[PDB]
Design a protein around this ligand. Structure first.
Ligand code: D5T
Ligand code: MG
Ligand code: ZN
Length: 333
């Protein structure tokens, strides 16, 4: 791979982010992007600052410089698609920082594990092309073939891991190079396990194992740490409905357009298109958010907060509040 030039670093370093608390639950990434031309440098600056303000890279021998390289190597592998772009992963990073520090989930993890989560956020969707795992299987594309031949149906997640492990194999972007022995091994293994658990086909399985582990006082401790890491990245990944309504709406618009584009390409190839991806059906934003809330998000956040993440209660509160707000949009459309 190429190296990261010194001008690119200064482009990020210069951004001062006035009037923005990056650690706050109500931080608005959309506002931050509209605040300037070159939102890709403001995005990266947000990640930079989050990782410094945690105190964590310094403790694991990661320099202010290779941190910035790592971010920019990540950024360059994100494509210009409507949802699964660089801004999604910065959002997941920032959101995870709030669960750890405002939600007190840091209490349940080592410092290394907190550092790994913040890093993993930034790699967890590398080289996403706006198409889901199903698309690669039904069209027998090379990645689908390659994943089917090695056993794993998690087509993209294996791919994102391969690219994470590739970015980290260059020493000038290796944020885990300051680690040795069991610590170094654990950074890689936990990063990879977390990215693989982002496959929503495995959603129910991962939730149910975390909850079983949290109910049991005699659970293996290392295993409960690992499941909690996985649950927190999953939580970040489905965190759009836990934000102030206007932010939550903007995320829903971006996702919807990405799904519609997949559906148009499925039509071109004669492959089957589920109704969620079908632009012509022209379903309302609101009904789809309420369905996501009821089937996926509300149960997930309610169950993990009750089982053991008590500090994350606001997520359940804001899901409820956003749901009633979408109900009001239907009732008055
Ligand atoms: C802002 O709103 C959204 C943000 C992200 C997503 C993603 N969706 N998914 C899958 C989640 C499971 N899924 C469902 O269709 C679940 N579901 C409903 O949504 C309502 C229903 C149709 C009535 C019944 C039902 O089963 C398929 C899509 C992903 O895998 C994406 C990538 C990773 C994580 C989440 C993200 C969806 C959003 O709004 C719908
Ligand atoms: Mg993903
Ligand atoms: Zn994601």
């Amino acid at each position: 791979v190429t190296a990261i030039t010194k001008v690119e670093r200064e482009a990020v370093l210069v951004c001062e982010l006035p009037s923005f608390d990056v650690t706050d639950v109500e931080f608005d990434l959309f506002r931050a992007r509209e605040s300037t031309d070159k939102p890709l440098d403001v995005a990266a600056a947000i990640a930079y600052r989050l990782l410094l303000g945690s105190g964590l890279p310094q403790k694991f021998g990661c320099s202010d410089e290779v941190l910035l390289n790592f971010i920019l190597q990540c950024r360059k592998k994100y494509r210009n698609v409507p949802y699964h772009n660089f801004y999604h992963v910065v959002d997941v990073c920032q959101t995870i920082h709030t669960f750890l520090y405002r939600g007190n989930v840091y209490e349940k993890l080592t410092e290394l594990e907190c550092f790994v989560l913040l890093i993993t956020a930034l790699v967890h969707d590398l080289d996403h092309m706006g198409l889901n795992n199903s698309f690669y299987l039904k069209t027998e594309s090379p990645l689908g073939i390659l994943s089917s031949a090695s056993g794993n149906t998690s087509v993209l997640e294996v791919h994102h891991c391969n690219l994470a492990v590739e970015i980290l194999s260059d020493p000038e972007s290796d944020v885990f190079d300051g680690l040795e022995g069991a610590e170094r091994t654990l950074a890689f293994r936990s990063m990879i396990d977390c990215v693989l658990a982002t496959d929503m086909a495995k959603h129910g399985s991962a939730l149910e194992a975390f909850l079983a582990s949290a109910a049991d006082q005699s659970s293996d401790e290392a295993a409960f740490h690992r499941m909690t890491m996985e649950i927190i990245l999953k939580a970040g990944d489905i965190s759009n409905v836990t934000k102030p309504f206007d932010i939550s709406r903007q995320w829903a618009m971006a996702v919807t357009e990405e799904f519609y584009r997949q559906g148009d390409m499925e039509k071109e190839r004669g492959v089957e298109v589920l109704p969620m991806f079908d632009r012509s059906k022209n379903m309302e934003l609101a009904k789809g958010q309420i369905g996501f809330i009821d089937f996926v998000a509300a149960p997930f956040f309610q169950k993990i907060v009750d089982a053991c993440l008590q500090g994350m209660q606001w997520t359940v509160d804001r899901i409820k509040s956003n749901r009633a707000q979408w109900e009001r949009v239907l009732e008055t459309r």
